[PDB]
Structure 1
Amino acid sequence: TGGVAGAADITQGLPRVIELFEARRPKAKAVISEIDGVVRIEETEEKLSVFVESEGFSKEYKLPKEARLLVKDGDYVEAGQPLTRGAIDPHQLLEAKGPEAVERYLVEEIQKV
């Protein structure tokens, strides 16, 4: 390159590759849903929380106020469907969606780099 500023080289992407091959949990981790449900939101200045409510049970997800959201309020998401923008915990995905979704996620995410 000559030392000019540009897009992310292999130096940036390689840690992601190793992060996926080693099945490690991301430092900045994306939060997914263990079960299916509908979205209900709660927002405050010093507190932000997103409720995933099903017909049989209800799960609360307390998030930092600065967190990004991939889901619209009142949507219908699958088990282990991305909510927070970021890398998915392969083991959270494993206990939720199963082996096939993990294999597909690993292969695709590694390929991306």
Structure 2
Amino acid sequence: EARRPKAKAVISEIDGVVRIEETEEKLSVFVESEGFSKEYKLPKEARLLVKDGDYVEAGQPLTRGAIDPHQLLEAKGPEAVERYLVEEIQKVYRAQG
């Protein structure tokens, strides 16, 4: 159905490189680009997938979880989401043999 999940992971809108900022009542991540960049707020115990300073593709999950296939489609293009969709279905079926 292409629903945007509840446990939605937050992907990156553009190319860039990250820098964590873990203060008490906020844990924000910046994916900075050679021009300008955006800031991604999220609850603190959220589980990262970016070692600070690493290099991210546009649409590459920063948090973990499921990916809104729409946020993906707009970010990385059809074969990109065509990819996610096929593999993600399969992981369920494999799991049951």
Q: What is the SS of the residue equivalent to 1:60?
A: strand
Q: Deviations over 1:30-62 (max 9, x none)?
A: 000010001111111211100010011111000
Q: Deviations over 1:50-108 (max 9, x none)?
A: 00100111110001101000110000010100111100000000000000010110000
Give me the TM-score of the superposition, normalised by structure 1: 0.80
Distance 1:60 1:45 in 2: 17
Percent identity over the alignment is 100
The residue aligned with 1:6 is: none
Across the aligned residues of Structure 1 and Structure 2, the Cα RMSD in angstroms comes to 0.6
Which of 84, 109, 112 is 2:63 aligned to?
84
Q: What is the SS of the residue equivalent to 1:63?
A: coil
The reply to whether residue 28 of structure 1 matches residue 7 of structure 2 is yes
Unaligned runs of 5+ in 1: 1-21
Give me the TM-score of the superposition, normalised by structure 2: 0.92
User: Any runs of at least 4 consecutive aligned residues in structure 1 with deviations exceeding 3 A, and if so which?
Assistant: none
Which structure has the larger Rg? Answer: 1
